[PDB]
Amino acid sequence: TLLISEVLKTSKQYLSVLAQVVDIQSSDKNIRLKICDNSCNQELKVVIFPDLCYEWRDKFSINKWYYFNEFVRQIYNDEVQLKNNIHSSIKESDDQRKVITYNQEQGVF
């Protein structure tokens, strides 16, 4: 598995990345995500296409970590992103802690 910091600069065609989903857009027949690391301060755009996108439609959870396995690296507008492809696979990370915090409106203090 490569870090997003790696992904941003690698020359590989195929990669696998463990990362957090910080944005979901289910805009029809495709899922578009932003994913995030602890290696970098930048997000990475991921597009999940027909086939794969069929099972992940309503599945993704915000801030959850997943293994994106054997995705394809591409460049669009000077921006690197990853895409689904025939060999691709996605798995929820089994070692993740759900933390629930509440923030209080501060104008009260």
UniProtKB/Swiss-Prot annotation:
Top-level taxonomic group: Eukaryota
Loss of function: phenotype: Critically short telomeres.
Annotated phenotype, changing Y76A: Reduced single-stranded telomeric DNA binding; does not affect telomerase activity of the holoenzyme telomerase ribonucleoprotein complex
Localization annotation: Chromosome, Telomere
Effect ascribed to mutating K29A: Reduced single-stranded telomeric DNA binding
Consequence recorded when altering K34A: Does not affect single-stranded telomeric DNA binding
Effect of H87A: Reduced single-stranded telomeric DNA binding
Listed result of changing K83A: Reduced single-stranded telomeric DNA binding
Protein function: Single-stranded DNA (ssDNA)-binding protein that mediates the recruitment of telomerase to telomeric DNA. Telomerase is an essential ribonucleoprotein (RNP) enzyme that copies new telomeric repeats onto chromosome ends by repetitively synthesizing the short telomere-repeat sequence 5'-TTGGGG-3' using an RNA template component TER.
Family recorded in the similarity comment: Belongs to the replication factor A protein 1 family.
Subunit details: Component of the telomerase holoenzyme complex, composed of the catalytic core (the catalytic subunit TERT, the telomerase RNA template component TER and TAP65/p65), which is associated with two heterotrimeric subcomplexes: (i) the replication protein A (RPA)-related subcomplex, composed of TEB1, RPA2/TEB2 and RPA3/TEB3 and (ii) the CST-like subcomplex, composed of TAP75/p75, TAP45/p45 and TAP19/p19. TEB1 and the CST-like subcomplex are tethered to the catalytic core by TAP50/p50.
Protein name (database record): Telomeric repeat-binding subunit 1
Source species of the chain: Tetrahymena thermophila (strain SB210)
Residues of the whole record sequence present: 375 to 483 of 701
